[PDB]
Design a protein around this ligand. Structure first.
Ligand SMILES: C#Cc1c(F)ccc2cc(O)cc(-c3ncc4c(N5CCC[C@@](C)(O)C5)nc(OC[C@@]56CCCN5CC(=C(F)F)C6)nc4c3F)c12
Ligand SMILES: Nc1nc2c(ncn2[C@@H]2O[C@H](COP(=O)(O)OP(=O)(O)O)[C@@H](O)[C@H]2O)c(=O)[nH]1
Ligand SMILES: [Mg+2]
Length: 168
């Protein structure tokens, strides 16, 4: 197996847990303890490669430590998640990218921008806005629904592809 260490980041309530559990366990959790942080492992084939995905679903308080810095820099690629009905979560993306670039000490870290909850009727964050930000960082952008499972496999598999590209 090729191992890939993925970290899922973004504001409380954007659906980091629901995206992870949809990929790992194939069901939608309506309630998942917002404070619970953990890593989940999944064997999957991506473009014919047998991959062991090790996925950190981030949680807890805004706390900076040498320990947390160390845990975060073991990530090889980052899923940067906002909700399409949460303007603040979209505005917070830059902050998360800056903390990733800081602990990785690099301007090129594999990353995918994810707009989650695309099943929801009214959006406050337009696809074009998110596309614009993705093009600026030079990363892929995908809209997902942890609820319907739309885009979920594609989001994680696209991040693995970015990590492969980075390896060259
Ligand atoms: C996240 C993250 C994170 C990385 F992506 C990379 C390296 C990190 C190193 C660290 O020591 C700490 C973090 C980290 N951990 C938690 C974090 C955390 N919490 C509270 C909300 C939910 C959570 C799961 O994101 C955990 N929250 C934030 O920023 C939240 C905002 C909202 C209030 C003001 N904060 C600053 C901000 C902006 F836009 F300026 C967004 N950062 C965290 C962080 F950088 C790193
Ligand atoms: N409608 C809808 N609700 C979602 C989606 N993803 C997550 N949720 C809900 O949004 C809330 C927060 O999700 P959670 O995964 O706990 O967010 P986290 O704090 O980022 O882990 C929960 O009530 C979830 O059921 C989605 O794609 N569509
Ligand atoms: Mg969660």
């Amino acid at each position: 197996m090729t191992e890939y260490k993925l970290v899922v980041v973004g504001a409380v309530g954007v659906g980091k847990s629901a995206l992870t559990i949809q990929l790992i366990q194939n069901h939608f959790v309506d309630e998942y303890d917002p404070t619970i942080e953990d890593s989940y492992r999944k064997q999957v084939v991506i473009d014919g490669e047998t991959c062991l995905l090790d996925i950190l679903d981030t949680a807890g308080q805004e706390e900076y430590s040498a320990m947390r810095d160390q845990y975060m820099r073991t990530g090889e690629g980052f899923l940067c998640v906002f909700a399409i009905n949460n303007t603040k979560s979209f505005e917070d993306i830059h902050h998360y990218r800056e903390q990733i670039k800081r602990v990785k000490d690099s301007e090129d870290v594999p990353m995918v921008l994810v707009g989650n909850k695309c099943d929801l009727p009214s959006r406050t964050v337009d696809t074009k806005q998110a596309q614009d930000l993705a093009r600026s960082y030079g990363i892929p952008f995908i809209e997902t629904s942890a609820k319907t499972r739309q885009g979920v496999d594609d989001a994680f598999y696209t991040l693995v592809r970015e990590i492969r590209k980075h390896k060259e």
